[PDB]
Write a protein that binds this ligand. Structure first.
Ligand code: HEM
Length: 153
């Protein structure tokens, strides 16, 4: 679990991300779709995007970007009791979109990759440590509802 002090740095650096939701939303995705071209093939609305130029112009991504990073916001505030924000996401993620838990790893890798970029003196080590927990945790709760519907895979 995250201790009081552990959620506090998380909730802290996310208070910063709050500041600007969509540009953040931006990079993260470009960092999924770059490092793991496999992810891209999931998004039926985004695969025309060959290059990374194409991929920053496109305004339909940005606003997917906020969509995603809102869903993550709410889950976080609910620190550690989020088991009611999660259920919609776990459901469609398995059944509609047919996503691997391992792409929820790739994504989780890309987030942190980018709050080290856009967030020094709060996203140092100790923040990076709790942050990775609380996503670690995000996927465990996700992964376990997957088992349930039978897509631990
Ligand atoms: C922090 C990770 C993620 C979160 C919170 C997230 C959140 C959501 C939200 C709220 C939407 C719209 C509502 C819905 O369709 O259920 C969405 C759509 C979708 N998610 Fe995610 N998603 C996540 C991770 C992933 C991962 C990494 C992939 C792919 C490798 C993925 C692929 C999809 C797909 C393809 C859609 C359908 C897009 C469309 O046609 O509108 N998601 N997800």
């Amino acid at each position: 679990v995250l201790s009081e002090g552990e959620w506090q740095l998380v909730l802290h650096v996310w208070a910063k991300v709050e500041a600007d939701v969509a540009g953040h939303g931006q990079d993260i995705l470009i960092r999924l779709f770059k490092s793991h071209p496999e992810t891209l093939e999931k998004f039926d609305r985004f695969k025309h995007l060959k290059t990374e130029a194409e991929m920053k112009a496109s305004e339909d991504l940005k606003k997917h970007g906020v969509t995603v990073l809102t869903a993550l916001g709410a889950i976080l505030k609910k620190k550690g009791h989020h088991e009611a924000e999660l259920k919609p996401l776990a459901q469609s993620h398995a059944t509609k979109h047919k996503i691997p838990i391992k792409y929820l790893e790739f994504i989780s890798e890309a987030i942190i990759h980018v709050l080290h970029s856009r967030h020094p003196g709060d996203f140092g080590a100790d923040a990076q440590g709790a942050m990775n927990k609380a996503l670690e945790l995000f996927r465990k709760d996700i992964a376990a509802k997957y088992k349930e519907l039978g897509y631990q895979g």
